[PDB]
């Protein structure tokens, strides 16, 4: 519905931490919603949590990796 | 499936690192299977991927800030 779009998404991200090292807006682009605890993101499709993000971390790599058969990770919203 | 005996998952975690902060009987215990890939486990029934277990973690704990809505964590398989 609205969290296909990008910046719907994004606009979760209200209250996220500040110094976490994988930015907001890379995270909505991968997919996220933030859930308003921690660096918990869930992605709005597969609804598949991710958290502690450490420096480096690829985050449509770790999606995949948790949601491998994803609709979002594998393109189903264009 | 085969999975809803906790002995059938506590097998998965051969060579699951023996310095983990989060015992492999204990991750069995919460519903997850050993991925085989670092410390990553997998919920048998909500496919949630969960890694970088830490001192403090609850294995329950995580799993549910993780799927709040998996059917293990809520009873399902009685
Ligand atoms: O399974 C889920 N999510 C899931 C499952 C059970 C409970 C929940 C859950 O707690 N959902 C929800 C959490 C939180 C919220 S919120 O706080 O209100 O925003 C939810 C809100 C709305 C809906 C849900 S929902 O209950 O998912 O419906 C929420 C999520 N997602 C998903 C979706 C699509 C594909 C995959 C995936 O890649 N799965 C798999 C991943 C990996 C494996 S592996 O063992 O590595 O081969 C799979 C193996 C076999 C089958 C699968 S399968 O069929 O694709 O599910 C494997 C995973
Ligand atoms: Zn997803
Ligand atoms: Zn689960």
Same mark, same amino acid.
Request: with cysteine; hydrophobic share 35%.
């Given at each position: 519905?609205?969290?296909?779009?990008?910046?719907?998404?994004?606009?979760? +991200?209200?209250? +996220? /931490?500040?110094?976490? /090292?994988?930015?907001?807006?890379?995270?909505?682009?991968?997919?996220?919603?933030?859930?308003?605890?921690?660096?918990?993101?869930?992605? +709005?499709?597969?609804?598949?949590?991710?958290?502690?993000?450490?420096?480096?971390?690829?985050?449509?790599?770790?999606?995949?990796?948790?949601? /491998?058969?994803?609709? +979002?990770?594998?393109?189903?919203?264009?």
């Amino acid at each position: 519905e609205e969290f296909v779009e990008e910046f719907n998404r994004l606009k979760t +991200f209200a209250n +996220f /931490p500040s110094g976490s /090292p994988v930015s907001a807006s890379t995270l909505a682009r991968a997919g996220f919603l933030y859930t308003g605890e921690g660096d918990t993101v869930r992605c +709005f499709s597969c609804h598949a949590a991710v958290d502690r993000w450490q420096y480096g971390d690829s985050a449509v790599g770790r999606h995949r990796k948790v949601s /491998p058969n994803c609709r +979002f990770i594998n393109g189903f919203y264009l």
